[PDB]
Design a protein around this ligand. Sequence first.
Ligand SMILES: N#Cc1ccc(Nc2nc(N)n(C(=O)Nc3ccc(OCC(=O)O)cc3)n2)cc1
Length: 272
Amino acid sequence: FHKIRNEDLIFNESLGQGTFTKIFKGVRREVGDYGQLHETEVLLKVLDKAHRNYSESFFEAASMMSKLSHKHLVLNYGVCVCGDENILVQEFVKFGSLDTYLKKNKNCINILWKLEVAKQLAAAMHFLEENTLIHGNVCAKNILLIREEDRKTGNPPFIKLSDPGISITVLPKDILQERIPWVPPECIENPKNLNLATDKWSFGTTLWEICSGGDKPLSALDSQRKLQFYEDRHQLPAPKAAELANLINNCMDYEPDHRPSFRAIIRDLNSL
Ligand SMILES: N#Cc1ccc(Nc2nc(N)n(C(=O)Nc3ccc(OCC(=O)O)cc3)n2)cc1
């Protein structure tokens, strides 16, 4: 990771929080192509001082994904360690997380839009699967909308997948249980069961989010009832747009080894 000086970064408005992170819009001053001076909008992710023990996990996940390059994976510019804080410096995506966008535009998004987004997400996961890289935190919040659909241009929306954040192999059990049903049942049984099959399950949950206008599945259940959900082997109800219900339940298979490959997922998406 390129190290960026604190002096080249301006912190602007808070954009909220992630897991043990604060999120800010910012600006980075840089010498760009042809020696031209640039002021680039950037997305700053700050690992809170209180959770400094988690520093290594957050930056190792960002780092391993950034060693790959792909059109559906977010760009990291570097890190800023010059100070009291550990900061990831990331490209600023104009429209933000998908879950927020879905809620704000529920009445204006149709099935073709959702399919286009699901295909792009599967393409990114296929790429990661072929490179045997585990993301570990696939969710609508971690999907970024680069561009909206422009009916007058025929151009479709474009999304990117954000960095994994802290690994579920090191998170507290309370956060893990609260992340049901994105976290697979076998990772609740044992966080060290993190595997490629993990991302197949979370892809299904994310698909449910997309098909549900940005609702959070099982949000009415507290932590103990979310555990009970897995104990009794329940499946999510069919979302509003039910066309993807079968794919969702196929991905959310309690048997990790029976979950389909993303190649097969893409074939099924393409059959609609
Ligand atoms: N209003 C508004 C607005 C507009 C544009 C943006 N843009 C923007 N550009 C990037 N790169 N962004 C993110 O990476 N976001 C993000 C932050 C925290 C996350 O946490 C996951 C977890 O840690 O659990 C996950 C994703 N976001 C953001 C907000």
